[PDB]
Amino acid sequence: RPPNIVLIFADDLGYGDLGCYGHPSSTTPNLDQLAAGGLRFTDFYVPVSLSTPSRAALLTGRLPVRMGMYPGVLVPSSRGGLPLEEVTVAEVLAARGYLTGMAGKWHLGVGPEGAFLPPHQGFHRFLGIPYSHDQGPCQNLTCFPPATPCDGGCDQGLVPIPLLANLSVEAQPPWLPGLEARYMAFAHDLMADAQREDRPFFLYYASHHTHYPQFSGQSFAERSGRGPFGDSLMELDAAVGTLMTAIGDLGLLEETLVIFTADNGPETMRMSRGGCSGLLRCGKGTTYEGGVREPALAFWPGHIAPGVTHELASSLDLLPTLAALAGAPLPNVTLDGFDLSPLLLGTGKSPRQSLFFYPSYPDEVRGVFAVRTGKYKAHFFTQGSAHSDTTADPACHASSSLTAHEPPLLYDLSKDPGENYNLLGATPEVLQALKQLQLLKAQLDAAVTFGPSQVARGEDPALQICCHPGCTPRPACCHCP
Amino acid sequence: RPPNIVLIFADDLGYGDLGCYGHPSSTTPNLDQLAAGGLRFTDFYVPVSLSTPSRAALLTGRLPVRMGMYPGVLVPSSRGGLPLEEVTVAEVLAARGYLTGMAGKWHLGVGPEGAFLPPHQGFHRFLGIPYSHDQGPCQNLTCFPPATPCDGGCDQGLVPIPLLANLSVEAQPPWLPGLEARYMAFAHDLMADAQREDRPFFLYYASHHTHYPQFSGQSFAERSGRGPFGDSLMELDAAVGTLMTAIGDLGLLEETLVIFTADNGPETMRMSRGGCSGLLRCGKGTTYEGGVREPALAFWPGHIAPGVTHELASSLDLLPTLAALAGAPLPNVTLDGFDLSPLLLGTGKSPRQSLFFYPSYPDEVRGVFAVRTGKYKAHFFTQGSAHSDTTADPACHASSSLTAHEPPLLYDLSKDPGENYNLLGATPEVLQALKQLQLLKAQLDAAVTFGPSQVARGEDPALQICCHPGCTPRPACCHCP
Ligand SMILES: *[C@H]1O[C@H](CO)[C@@H](O[C@H]2O[C@H](CO)[C@@H](O)[C@H](O)[C@H]2NC(C)=O)[C@H](O)[C@H]1NC(C)=O
Ligand SMILES: *[C@H]1O[C@H](CO)[C@@H](O[C@H]2O[C@H](CO)[C@@H](O)[C@H](O)[C@H]2NC(C)=O)[C@H](O)[C@H]1NC(C)=O
Ligand SMILES: [Mg+2]
Ligand SMILES: [Mg+2]
């Protein structure tokens, strides 16, 4: 029987942040235990370094330009959304009779009467926030109890952040120091109800950690020894421990696949309240390894043996691997990932040879920015980003504008994961890798047509969720805490 | 009974190079296994980022300026050396009847008739090279068999690199692809002879890995997937596995303490043939965390439980911890380290609160460059270094000259291990940390007097070891391969 699947997706968490990936001061003991008894990926990626596009690619297994999830991210007034025609993972498992649930951040659009919310995209249950938790004013929110306010205020002129239950506003805004319990409790109930109906569950846990502003419940506040980013990562980690215990308590260890990853690199613009890309260069917002190479853990006792692969994998491969593993069939669409079960089960290698990376602002004349094949990565274009400012590497800053590279900047990621030493700027291994990387970009660029942008369809403030429909004056009247 | 102690010391190996410290492509499975069953330090340091000074501080537990081991490092023609009056670790254990042995790099001086070599400083046995393996021409040496030459040539106009056995030249130069077996074999014989005389051994294994030029025996050549730096680190790692097996085979697991660390940060000047400081800044040659924060593993089954401490420790603390653990008494000199056995055995905390860092070129008007207390590190002076050139961080380059900082640059290493965000440039926690850091530098600077420099005592080419004493023309006639 198809296994129970729990998929945890962190926010803005970098390759250097878990203790098991090197950080000297993070406290993440549950995730360190998953790694110890599971497969830890050294080379897993997402294809775009922002929340919306990355969340689209994970849920559909498709490159976000194919369905319009560019440029940038969706906002609360956004008209647009992940089109209802896309088939998400949830649709695929639900059809094979999984009881499917989602807690936490959606960021795939809201729309006219909530048309784009999770309940329309295959989730049976949903408790969470429809976009990112800083997309609403937070100067008066508490981030750390008893009364430590969130820092900097978040986005102004907006409705406060709403917690939803299917399409209804449960709270607005919610109490950040208690979000976690709400989500643990929703998770526990979905497990148990699934067990009791004799059915596999799919839990999609999109945490708010470790996105700005940082918050945690009172057990973690000031307990990690890495300040607010730490406390917030310790809570995420504790949360994981909790789901693992609940998996315990219902006798489901050997019957559940648990995967952890994160949507994109760290926001170093938040300085020491933001993540760490460890040795990789830059972060969120860029196509350097720091923004697109994420941590990734796969645990299934008695199916996946403890270890470390260096094989290539993407968040784009998760739909196809989970369909395979649950005996569900694939949507009838072009998919950009592959099944990795041979790699997970130890019977094979990853089928993936190449990875393609688009910028925050893609366009059809430039096409893909970077391509990785085997050990080699070519950058055809480079660009820094405000989400990665403040570090000492100047190629990460927003003042490093869009620069073309012809011939591309060429790195051997197995000896230079750091992306410091351009091999062109000329061996037969190299030149052969160069002609391949050039042919693969020209091939994808001639074959992908960009789906018309959802984000450019505009904003309308009337689309903001409001607790007290009709009230006045908007947006501040919208609120039922 | 005092335990058998094996102390492994790598060369130019950074905080980001072991697989267990985060590297995505290194292959170090034996050391990853030590960490898994031992205590892994996140915050262990050396006090000076070069080979000579660091090797002096480990062996005596004293700050290298106290006995003249500055500026820079010793060369083959050097007149000077670690003074014979210093009491090394080897002296301390030998006196309590350890059979003491050393394999690999000395770099503590040679001198007129080998007066400063290991056999005069407490080692019963010694097989190794009296300085660094690139300090002699290597354009004709093989680094990777069957016939891959060492890269770049090393130092010219010198006698070739000599392999010594006590004070005799065994080979000149030696066959780099076979150094490891020679050293494994010497280690095995010291174990066994110690077992058979009913006595504890002390093995001091100073590896040549991962110093330039890189080399390995034919089992590792081209096998790691990180190129020559990898192959060379895989061999070091395999070597460790071997000593662990020999510890197995003579029934000595529970009776031996094995420690691994490294003398100083990575030489990023060798680009992708050099190490990785992971998230820390810069490398070898500097007083940034990248040059002085090393990996460190302590393993003793049934004495030290598996885990991770964040407590402060230094290479300066090893003499005193090993004396304590062997019931030997301490030299009657000022020591700058502490016993850490409570921390190793789980009964206590590190006594160390503060760490002091000197530059490659110290001087008495400037005094210590940086000071760490608790979580805070102050830099009073900063300076880049040619050994750390070629990265994107400009503070590491040799073009970043000696700059004073008053008030000092102040970092909170628990949230900013990266040393990116200066907290001055002003909370009560901060200001209190600032007055302490200032008082501790002024205190050490008024109390340490610099021992007269050994390195300035000059060079004399007649002090170069020569296989064929008297031959002509020197240096090329010196050679018996
Ligand atoms: C809102 O919608 C879902 C789906 O109806 C609610 O669904 C569940 O509610 C009860 C148990 O949780 C039962 O009445 C229904 O069996 C159940 N439906 C399914 C398909 O499981 C759910 O409670 C709400 N979502 C959440 C948890 O917020
Ligand atoms: C050179 O010096 C040491 C010390 O004499 C040699 O010592 C050992 O040699 C034999 C066994 O290894 C025995 O003859 C002696 O017991 C022994 N001495 C001690 C104190 O162990 C040694 O072989 C040489 N050093 C090496 C290994 O190069
Ligand atoms: Mg994000
Ligand atoms: Mg060195």
Mapped to the 3 state alphabet, what secondary structure does chain B carry? CCCEEEEEEECCCCCCCCHHHCCCCCCCHHHHHHHHCCEEEEEEECCCCCHHHHHHHHHHCCCCCCCCCCCCCCCCCECCCCCCCCCCHHHHHHCCCCEEEEEECCCCCCCHHHCCCHHHHCCCEEEECCCCCCCCCCCCCEEECCCEECCCCCCCCCCCCCEEECCEEEEECCCHHHHHHHHHHHHHHHHHHHHHCCCCEEEEEECCCCCCCCCCCCCCCCCCCCHHHHHHHHHHHHHHHHHHHHHHHCCCHHHEEEEEEECCCCCHHHHHHCCCCCCCCCCCCCCCHHHHEEEEEEECCCCCCCEEECCCEEHHHHHHHHHHHHCCCCCCCCCCCCCCHHHHHCCCCCCCCEEEECCCCCCCCCCCCEEEECCEEEEEEECCCHHHCCCCCHHHCCCCCCEEEEEEEEEECCCCCCCCCCCCCCCHHHHHHHHHHHHHHHHHHHHCCCCCCCHHHCECHHHCCCCCCCCCCCCCCCCEC
Interhelix angle A29-36/A227-249, nearest 10 degrees: 50
Find out whether B10 and B236 touch, Cβ atoms under 8 Å.
yes
Give residues 349 to 378 of A whose Cβ lies within 8 Å of B. 375
> CA–CA separation, A38 vs B200, rounded Å?
39
- Partners of A16 on chain B (C-beta within 8 Å) are 22, 278-279
B344 and B39 Cβ atoms separated by less than 8 Å: yes
Largest CA distance in chain A: 70
Angle (deg, nearest 10), helices B29-36 and B227-249: 50
Decide whether any atom of ligand 2 lies within 6 Å of the B186 Cβ.
Answer: yes
Q: Which ligand 2 atom is nearest residue B168's CA?
A: 1
**In one letter, which amino acid is B270?**
R
Using alpha carbons only, how large is chain A's radius of gyration in Å?
Answer: 21
> Of A357, A315, A333, which is closest to residue A57 (Cα–Cα)?
A315
In a 13 Å sphere around the CA of A196, the CA atoms on its Cβ side amount to 6
Lookup result for tokens 């130019």: B12
Interval between CA A125 and ligand 1 midpoint (Å): 6
What amino acid occupies position B103? Answer: A
Q: Which atom of ligand 1 is nearest to the CA of A166?
A: 1
Please name the residue that has the structure tokens 């890798």.
A433
Residue A284 has what DSSP assignment? T
Verify whether the Cβ–Cβ distance B418 to A281 is below 8 Å.
no
Residue A269 near residue A17, CB atoms below 8 Å: no
Which residue minimizes the CA distance to atom 13 of ligand 2?
B193
Name the token pair of B154: 């090393």
The Cα–Cα gap between A50 and A73 comes to 7
Q: Which residues, in sequence order, are bridge partners of residue A377?
A: A372, A411
How far does the centroid of ligand 3 lie from the alpha carbon of residue B380, in Å? Answer: 38
**Nearest residue to B200 via CA among B296, B101, B299, B128:** B101
Contact B42 A21 (CB under 8 A): no
Judge contact between A431 and A406, C-beta under 8 A: no
Distance CA A473, CA A475 (A): 6
By CA distance, what is B43's nearest residue in A?
A: A24
The tokens for A100 are 């499917």
Residues 6+ apart with CB under 8 A from A251: none
> Bridge partners of B411?
B377
Task: Name which of A304, A413, A390, A355 is nearest A34 in CA terms.
Answer: A304
Residue A236: count of CB within 10 angstroms of its CB: 26
- Asked if A272's CB is within 8 angstroms of B412's CB, the reply is yes
The nearest CA of chain B is from the CA of A420 a distance in Å of: 7
Q: Do residues A21 and B22 lie in contact, with contact meaning Cβ atoms separated by under 8 Å?
A: yes
Beta bridge partners of A459: A78
Consecutive H or E run containing A409: strand A403-412
Per the CB < 8 A criterion, the answer to whether A291 and A285 are in contact is yes
Nearest CA among A264, A311, A260 for reference residue A290: A264
Tell me how far apart the alpha carbons of residues B417 and A271 are, in angstroms, rounded to a whole number: 12
DSSP string, A240-264: HHHHHHHHHHTT-GGGEEEEEEESS
Task: Select from B205, B43, B208, B189 the least CA-distant residue to B134.
Answer: B208
CA of A252: how far to CAs of A51, A181, A200, A245, in Å? Answer: 31, 21, 10, 10
Cα atoms in the Cβ-side hemisphere of radius 13 Å centred on B364: 10
Q: Which two tokens stand for residue B148?
A: 């891959």
For B314-336, letters b (16+ CB in 10 Å) and e give: bbbbbbbbbbbbbebeebeeebb
Show the domains of chain B with their CATH numbers.
1-352+450-481 (3.40.720.10), 353-449 (3.30.1120.10)
Q: Which A positions 198-237 lie with beta carbon below 8 A of chain B?
A: 225-227, 229-230
Residue B339, CA atoms < 13 Å, CB-side half-sphere:
14
Residue B101: beta bridge partners? B125, B203
Is B124's C-beta closer than 6 angstroms to any atom of ligand 2? yes
Partnered with residue A103 across adjacent β-strands are A127, A205
Residues 6 or more apart whose CB falls under 8 angstroms from that of A234 comprise: A27, A28, A216, A220, A223, A224
The answer to whether B210 touches B14, Cβ cutoff 8 Å, is no
Q: What angle do CA B386, B392, B395 make, to 5 degrees?
A: 55
Q: CA–CA separation, B53 vs B62, rounded Å?
A: 10
- Is residue A285 within 8 Å of A292, Cβ to Cβ? no
Pocket test for ligand 1, best of A93, A120, A125 (most atoms within 8 A of CB): A125
Asked how this structure was determined, the answer is X-ray
How far is B205 from B108, CA to CA, in rounded Å?
15
Contact B417, A25 (CB under 8 A): yes
Nearest CA to A237 out of A217, A266, A265, A263 is that of A217
The tokens of B13 are what? 């190996």
| Cβ contacts of B226 on chain A, cutoff 8 Å | 414-415
Contacts of B310 in chain A (CB under 8 A): 24-25, 225
Rounded to whole angstroms, what are the CA distances from B296 to A327, B32, B236, B314?
Answer: 47, 12, 15, 10
Whole-number Å distance, alpha carbon B13 to ligand 4 midpoint, is 8
Distance B97 CA to ligand 2 centre (A): 15
First CA to last CA across chain B, in angstroms? 43
Q: What is the resolution of this structure in A?
A: 2.7
Torsion angle of alpha carbons B459, B464, B469, B473, nearest 10°?
-80
Chain A interface includes B272 (CB < 8 A): yes
Q: Which of residues 412-451 of B touch A (CB under 8 A)?
A: 412-418, 420-421
